[PDB]
């Protein structure tokens, strides 16, 4: 069940508004935290995210994710952040510059090439180069905010890049 | 992997658009269609949904869902529809009247009471009547279009009903 969460390594979140509440608990594996989050059992809220402290083998279930207002994230090798896809807007607004969804396949059905690889296609579109644009894994993105919306370098050598078929949130 | 699809028993989809392409194949089980869809390995498009023909134990992979334009659904006992949640708007527009996501947990974190149940709470919100409102399972909904957004009757005898924390597509 831990696979249906967007994972961001060495990350955790921090709150600000005292009202915003948490629930923690020692555990064995990060898997263990996912089941409880997904099932939303014994939790005084909606599990939209959780962190697993690999160091203190702990689960940190949150009623919010990295894009929640009033919460910032922090570095930690020992931490691993898992966000519930059901709470990460999966549709596009405008040119889709703020799309953080997990679609990784182009419109014609071809798997996206990670932004970390220069194979098959070489490129200067590196994560460090574009901060805030979430160029993680091989997720369809639109760092430059171009007309076509989110796209990705294809794993098919003949197709340098292509657009992804992510829907618009509201286009009547 | 089939659990990451919204299921609509006895249902299938009929394209109207001739371009909009499909791909079919005999298979053994419906799970078999899911894996192929999720992976999107042998398809010339983005799998957003698929139908499993229990009769002809067949798979119909679609580059669209029940809310795609130019495609109508049809009834059929031998058919089951599965839509990729990654393509079913997961945020709310306005009062949330057209919400079709699968969130089934009120804001305080309690499981929803399916609409087909009169226990714990009895009600006048049944599928039968108010249709087109997808009162399936225990999905948070807003058939009437009320102020607070999609909600549900709580499986907690102490709480008649409560609202869910489904994000608005206009984040904040």
Curated annotation (Swiss-Prot), chains A, B:
Domain of life from the UniProt record: Eukaryota
Disulphide bonds in the chain: 33-59, 37-47, 91-169, 112-152, 140-164
Residues annotated as domain PAN: 1-86
Residues annotated as domain Kringle: 91-169
Designated name of the protein: Hepatocyte growth factor alpha chain
